[PDB]
Symmetry: D3
Subunit: 304 residues, 6 copies
């Protein structure tokens, strides 16, 4: 069955839109959902062959119950707030996600305009971020960001619902968190101290050797094997964003996985820690201000 564009690569531009559905807005939303692929093609065909416009649409747990009766995806539940001793992953409201990507911001903006035009009066905007590529795929911490994403068949196996939930095969689960960074504190570290926080070399993006990589480095904590042997993988399409006057330097985190348990395990390790690490050191420079979980159905579910 045909997935949405959850497997597609990073692009140079993105718009992330999160909205809540107003009381009585359900019908309007359902009608838009049935049209969203049409709208994407309407805008996107204009910029063949380099436009690379896509839109992934996600639905929250509470929204699901308001919109649909009957079958629910097995892993769909509200984002779980994690209150660590020091750092907190907050749960914030969000019923629908539109993850819009293209090679140019205009395409993303034109599609978002059409979507929101159809939803005006039925939804309330919760968050809107316009993301942009930063040099050679860097984030606002200055590190190459996305390197260890799965590709090809390994990506398919890590991201797409299959025979464990066959009515929903071809779907995925998206976790979003908007992070703001303390760039003044971060820039007070040496490069070598930043490398130890992340677990990779800053300029060249080469992973630190195991004898050197700290236990509380980001890469250490988000490296998880299940009882099975295999690495647990997620597909991240994080984008930088910001505003210089407000001193806002951000990473918009979005991670896709076949079940949310994988992403949640990673978050637990980061925010609550392990026996050998109290928390991910990246959170000493990164504050999460949103957190929401969505199911992104197979394309044909929406088309109904």
């Amino acid at each position: 069955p045909e997935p949405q564009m959850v497997l597609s690569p990073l692009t140079s531009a993105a718009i992330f839109l999160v909205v809540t559905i107003d009381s009585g807005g359900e019908d309007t939303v359902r009608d838009l959902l049935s049209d969203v692929a049409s709208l994407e093609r309407a805008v996107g065909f204009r910029a063949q062959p380099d436009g690379r416009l896509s839109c992934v649409t996600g639905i929250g747990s509470e929204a699901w119950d308001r919109l649909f009766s009957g079958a629910r995806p097995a892993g769909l539940h509200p984002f779980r707030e994690l209150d660590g001793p020091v750092h907190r992953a907050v749960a914030t409201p969000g019923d629908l996600l539109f993850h819009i990507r293209a090679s140019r911001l205009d395409l993303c903006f034109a599609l978002a305009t059409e979507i929101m035009g159809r939803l005006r009066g039925a939804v309330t905007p919760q968050d809107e971020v316009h993301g942009f590529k930063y040099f050679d795929e860097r984030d606002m911490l200055g590190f190459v960001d996305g390197t260890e994403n799965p590709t090809g068949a390994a990506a398919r196996r890590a991201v797409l619902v299959g025979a464990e939930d066959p009515a929903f095969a071809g779907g995925s689960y998206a976790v979003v968190q908007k992070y703001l960074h303390d760039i003044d504190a971060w820039e007070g570290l040496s490069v070598e101290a930043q490398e130890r926080v992340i677990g990779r070399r800053k300029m060249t993006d080469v992973e630190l050797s195991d004898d050197v990589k700290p236990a509380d480095s980001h890469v250490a904590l988000t490296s998880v094997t299940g009882p099975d042997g295999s690495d647990l993988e997620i597909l991240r399409d994080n984008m930088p964003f910001g505003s210089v006057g407000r001193e806002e330097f951000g990473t918009y985190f979005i991670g896709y996985a076949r079940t949310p348990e994988v992403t949640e395990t990673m978050l637990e390790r980061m925010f609550l820690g392990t026996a050998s690490a109290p928390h991910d050191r990246i959170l000493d420079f990164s504050t999460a201000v949103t957190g929401s979980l969505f199911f992104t159905p197979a394309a044909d579910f929406l088309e109904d």
Copy 2:
């Protein structure tokens, strides 16, 4: 598994459409050329890797097939039927071989067409040659985005490629071509709003009109045909603009691929003969078909093994 020709490939910036008829006695030369056409395509195309995107799709008409081949025939292959509506007509014009040549640059198309025609000189008579070009943001000469609702991915394969219904010809497709000339002086006299009602989509933004406002005789309404499965019937269109300003020739070269000609024919009947709701497609009040031919585009391995 048979390897299709490049019938699922996207629109390109440049195209040449060449239609020829096979002269009496020319059959041998044509067979030879058909066996070499992939080699010719590589010879030219490899030069411009990786952004050339050269391809050539070769099609064979019904009458031609019967002249060329003792053996099995594609199940749906017949001559294009003239459609003589009360007002508008879809003419049937001669064509035995189609070459649909696309690239990101005209020079590649022209070089390959030169090589093909050089082989065929003295065995065929040219009927039509069109040099197509992309016009702004995938627009046609009417100013509308053209190709939006083409199928992609798996749906395209299912809509376009012959499968187990005709196993000897699996991986083939059917192409219909019509050269249309537009009355641009009449068209440009309409408001944008009236043009949108002819087509059924918004002109600048390419968004479909809502069902409550889209006329029954708009192009999109009449070419939207629901199959038994509840789903719309789909074709893949590779239409290209063409023209000549001095002669006031402003054209759309229509080419549509489908797994069976019955889909394209049903759309044509609705456009030219109308429905209970609609006398004919309003696009035809601004568009004249001057050619019409139907071709089978076999699997690439079919051509190779002549």
Copy 3:
């Protein structure tokens, strides 16, 4: 006499930064003004030949008096509020303008970061806009925007200060205004009605002929002839911006001219009208929320601080 990059073309990305200088922040600002070209090269050189990074720095009238002790450019004054019967061009605070352009937003953002890093604690931000190209050089009203900009020698003559003010030759004057548009109202007009508001055809960008072009159309009102029969020109580097959730669909207006008088005459025609036209119809769909005037000195002036 080397100008700043005021004659450079439109790019696909821009950042517009307007700040005010805090009391006691004058010395820090002067140091930064002297280094801005070095900072531009530091970021820009990374992305040649296609980055096309540039930064034009402007200084307002009030700030000029706080920073510098010598002569003032002859045309430098605070932006003049225009209070029309129906529409108003507001004057808002702004001491320094940074007009940053590149083919990619990251270069603009990196440069803006370096500038603001130097200025933190000395300036208060007043406006920041991240502009982006919209299809085929369109604005948020869906019209091609920039067509009649002067080029070549005509641009230099229209834009650069010359012998009229010789101490400031190679400078220019920038007027900025942030406009928000009422897209719901605009989309209620037919295309033909919109054409009559602007004065050009929407899809093809061809000018309406003089017989059909309304006198209160934008193009008619911003077409001004000099006493010498000669068209008065400005150079506009307008960019779209916006936010869909807030229903913010914007034009960031920036115009460069050799004297502000040209830009002001255009604004007066638009907001106050003429004998033939009460006001520019574009303003029935556009609200100005900022308005500031800056002088952009020659590059050597800033270097020699």
Copy 4:
């Protein structure tokens, strides 16, 4: 004086349009001429920065007298037919030339459409050619074509009218000829024989040494010295064109020069020959089927009308 874009480089796409002016068409024509710069910008601005759209407009000898009162350019006369013993340079009708270039055919086509739409009923089309780049700047004979064109200051001196005709300074003269090639005959020659016809190496574009270069080679006959021993140069913007079904493999020749005497001297040498050479060997594989001469005035001459 601002010239038209006569010094501008070769582009990947071009449209050449030649028309004649019907009875009573003059007013319509003059009105279009005053507007062509405006139309070019209207279309061209949409494809900043890479569109590279330009339009050069030329006016023939007879048409000049119909359109304009008073002074004529000194060198403007009808194309002179050259009836050689073997080959002939034909003269054909042509009142106006539009040489339209861009990086993409769509821009050229859009502009041509707007020009012709304004001229409907006033003109009769004579020729229309859609030219395209062929590999690495080759012509239909398979040679790199344009190499020795002048550049920079040498180009301005070879092409622009100056103080020798001061009322028309910044103009130029264009000669056009459409050539169709006998490719079957050409392809019957070895590469080494082709190189002796042209005077350059086929693959590498290197000029043959003087030891080896034949005197009836194309490059020998079109290399001409002025009485002061200096090289007479023209600027050629020729483009390939063709139709495979009609066996039509063409060179559209267009050459600009500050006086037509230079281009005429080259044509005389090619068609009529010299002491050492009966005619240019390229003409044994190339037939001229059009020939016309135009004056391309300074851009401001057209604007002023």
Copy 5:
């Protein structure tokens, strides 16, 4: 199960070919390196998404295999067999590991090469290093378009990847490398017409000569090999030009992939030792092989499994 290395990927504009021998006791460092090469590839390559197109194919020679690995060997893996023709020699030269690095830009290739060699310093001795570059429209140093008849799509997978005939190593391939230097002075003394007869294709247009004019000793005639069933045997070549004008080194770096070495060997035998009608490939009258090595390039998961 089976995930190939990037042995099917297209030509790129830049390449680095690195051939090294393993020093005594360097086996552990090499094993470690091999398990990390994919990681290094991603570390460098992700920086230049989407256009960088960085890949690295790692090969292991016959003698190396037995020093590194316990257990089964690939069925086809043996040392390159020297071929001593009367006139021309295909030399066998040392080489334990091959790194075939490709990208759209040399910087990416160089950066990855730097990381690989930094890990291996002390454990290996360099034998050969060539930096290849695209030359015009996919030309080689003889001025001919080079690569044209490479198989594509399913035909390439069938020709290149090991399958059911050696299931433990399914998804692997065999690479043969030969560094050629050309005698350009002698070559450029030939007419174009003579050059075309050596190669068997037209020079400027890359169109194949018809078989009825193609010399039996032309390079294309001799490297056209029909198997038992009359099917063409195919290899995948990623040859690149290289050179130094000052020392008059004008080179072709030959690299050919095949699912068994026998195909590539047959072609080399035909070249260097000739047939009934042709003593040897005329291309060799203008080209000298100065290296020759054979490598197995395992499935990606094999290398990672260390």
Copy 6:
């Protein structure tokens, strides 16, 4: 007087070829010098409009006297070896320099092939380096390299001979040195230590503040003011090159300037040091293995041979 392409920007590919002239090869070399513009055009034209091919030809002091009679450029002498306490700038043979640049190596190689083909039997190659762009204009030390190059009028003033030596106006002097780097040692330093060696931030390429910039830092030692207070500048077109197997990680240094004394003053400061610096710390990780000085004449000098 028209210069060679000495003011043109950095490109992503380059070939540097240094040859000596064999006894008896003088006539062959003179013929080639007169044809090099021709050759460049022959190859370059094929890759209009983006090839960006150029070749600058330089001639050393000893060669000059073998090739030419009469007046010589005022500053043309053999490269002066610098024997420092610790590091040495070696002088190596070189009679001609071809500095070839383009956006693609094939164009460089094709032109080099043509040149060398004309010179076979007359010259012996001394050095050939194929340079390549490294990420965002980085060198092998990982720093952005070229940032503070002069542009515009300042570049012209810094690089072209003028009235100080009027017979040779429009020429320049090129110094070349091939450096190999000890990357293993370099990588043992912290980023912060590397930054102190260079005088700029590694990732962002911003210059270190005056206060923290060491006296023996590269940028400090190559910042030079003349007696009149003016900054002495050179134009650098250095390119990375290397061979991983041989652990050769190189910077090919090439610097143009209107007099050798400017570049020589910088080299003296680097290798022999100053009051507050024994030598440039960059030399602790860089070894010069060639050193040659060439005069690059105006283009019209070459053509006139």
